[PDB]
Amino acid sequence: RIGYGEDSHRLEEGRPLYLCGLLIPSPVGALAHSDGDAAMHALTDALLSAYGLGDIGLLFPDTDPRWRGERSEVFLREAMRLVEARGAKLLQASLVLTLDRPKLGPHRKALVDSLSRLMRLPQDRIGLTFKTSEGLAPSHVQARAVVLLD
Amino acid sequence: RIGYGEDSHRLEEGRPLYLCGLLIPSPVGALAHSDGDAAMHALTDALLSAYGLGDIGLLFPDTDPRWRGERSEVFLREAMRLVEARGAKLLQASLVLTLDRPKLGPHRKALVDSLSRLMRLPQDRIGLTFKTSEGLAPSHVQARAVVLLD
Amino acid sequence: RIGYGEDSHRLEEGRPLYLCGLLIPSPVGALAHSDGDAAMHALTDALLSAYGLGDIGLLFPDTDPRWRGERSEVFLREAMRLVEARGAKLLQASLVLTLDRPKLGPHRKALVDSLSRLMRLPQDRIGLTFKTSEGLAPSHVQARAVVLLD
Numbered sequence A, B, C: 001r002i003g004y005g006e007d008s009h010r011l012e013e014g015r016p017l018y019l020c021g022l023l024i025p026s027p028v029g030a031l032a033h034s035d036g037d038a039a040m041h042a043l044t045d046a047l048l049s050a051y052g053l054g055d056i057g058l059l060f061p062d063t064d065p066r067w068r069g070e071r072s073e074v075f076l077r078e079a080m081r082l083v084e085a086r087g088a089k090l091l092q093a094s095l096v097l098t099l100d101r102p103k104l105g106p107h108r109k110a111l112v113d114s115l116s117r118l119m120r121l122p123q124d125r126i127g128l129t130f131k132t133s134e135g136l137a138p139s140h141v142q143a144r145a146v147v148l149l150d
């Protein structure tokens, strides 16, 4: 099984930035009613997609007391709960984060270690890459992710 | 086998919106020489891609009287006829549609049913998710798709 | 195993265009430190990502002599050496190039042939499709790629 997911968020100056579950020191951060963690959301959508379960907006509406105000890792762990209850064994996740700043290079080990811990995947099964937007989307963070299971 | 495909169309007020082979009531719809069904186009290219067969511009150009003016489902079914003839068995389709409006949530069931029917896949093998552009592409519909075969 | 990668470059007039390892006749070429070959960069990142090896800015800084002024095929072949050393057997590459001009259709045979030879894959395992940006990115080339191994 395969799943494909995307997420993007507007970045504004002076707001905290959350990526792969971690607070990343930054001059910019998500402008959103969620934590804006685009890695988390895209991976979450990919996992749900792999089982045709819907998407994060359908399954994690903030109108719902269980998810409102919560950080995005909660949604990802619920998604993995759901797909595991359906027999899933997650094998791999490969994703690309697109943002002009900050540079994620300095945080690469922590970021990957986070994804590995949260999805209980060995680090060679976590493929994380970073790109700038080259001026195409200077004010956003974008994430696109593929997951493989079974 | 795997294939990856993309498509996008400009959206204009008062044009019909076609997605996943359906008419979706909308204030905006594709401006294009096709029906602008981004979902079908992406899926069609992903299928063709999985066998190296080309892209929809190569195989279904509107200078070819067979294809000009045809709905995009026609192209999708021909792409599966072509891969099937080369031995493929489609297994899974996971795709993301990005558009600010209209909301596709209230049409999710219809949309997933349509893909399921057109591709002859069980609904747990149709992974459809929806995103807004968060202001990046407010006048476009975008689609990105992965397919899995055998 | 699977991997996903992306790349983009600004395009300027009076600049050579390299794609899929080839110089393409074009009125615009990448504005970039590298040769700006978005297809090769995306494919390289996808390969690296399939083994959790990092990304092209991590493995190929210009600060390392080995890589300075080097054409992108050197990066791609380094990344296949690395996954090959880990027992990988590349099975397929499927990627989408997005750019308004120049038209890539007239060069489809050459482009696919180049990828086939560089990655040592049969042509039906090279899935290449082309898209315009429909107005969204008129001065950039973008590339998004999935690789499948074993």
Ligand SMILES: Nc1ccn([C@@H]2O[C@H](COP(=O)(O)OP(=O)(O)O)[C@@H](O)[C@H]2O)c(=O)n1
Pocket (backbone or CB within 6 Å): A007, A008, A032, A034, A041, A055, A056, A057, A058, B098, B099, B100, B101, B102, B103, B104, B105, B106, B130, B131, B132, B133, B134
């Ligand atoms: N055209 C659209 C776009 C999104 N959506 C749903 O709207 C939700 C929220 O989309 P969004 O782009 O604002 O997502 P987030 O900010 O929650 O990351 C999705 O998860 C999809 O459920 C929709 O029904 N129709």
Ligand SMILES: Nc1ccn([C@@H]2O[C@H](COP(=O)(O)OP(=O)(O)O)[C@@H](O)[C@H]2O)c(=O)n1
Pocket (backbone or CB within 6 Å): B007, B008, B032, B034, B041, B055, B056, B057, B058, C098, C099, C100, C101, C102, C103, C104, C105, C106, C129, C130, C131, C132, C133, C134
């Ligand atoms: N730079 C490009 C862009 C597109 N193309 C071909 O041009 C066609 C039409 O591209 P488009 O972005 O206008 O696609 P559609 O409107 O048909 O969805 C493709 O399906 C590719 O065959 C090309 O050869 N070179």
Ligand SMILES: Nc1ccn([C@@H]2O[C@H](COP(=O)(O)OP(=O)(O)O)[C@@H](O)[C@H]2O)c(=O)n1
Pocket (backbone or CB within 6 Å): A098, A099, A100, A101, A102, A103, A104, A105, A106, A129, A130, A131, A132, A133, A134, C007, C008, C032, C034, C041, C055, C056, C057, C058
């Ligand atoms: N926000 C970001 C963006 C890119 N990067 C690293 O920055 C490098 C160069 O990014 P780029 O978008 O300029 O890539 P290229 O021009 O080399 O194709 C990478 O390949 C990623 O290592 C980062 O650490 N943090």
Ligand SMILES: [Mg+2]
Pocket (backbone or CB within 6 Å): A007, A008, A009, A034, A036, A037, A038, A041
């Ligand atoms: Mg989000």
Ligand SMILES: [Mg+2]
Pocket (backbone or CB within 6 Å): A132, A134
């Ligand atoms: Mg750069």
Ligand SMILES: [Mg+2]
Pocket (backbone or CB within 6 Å): B007, B008, B009, B034, B036, B037, B038, B041
């Ligand atoms: Mg189209």
Ligand SMILES: [Mg+2]
Pocket (backbone or CB within 6 Å): B032, C132, C134
């Ligand atoms: Mg067009």
Ligand SMILES: [Mg+2]
Pocket (backbone or CB within 6 Å): A032, B132, B134
């Ligand atoms: Mg939102």
Ligand SMILES: [Mg+2]
Pocket (backbone or CB within 6 Å): C007, C008, C009, C034, C036, C037, C038, C041
């Ligand atoms: Mg590049």
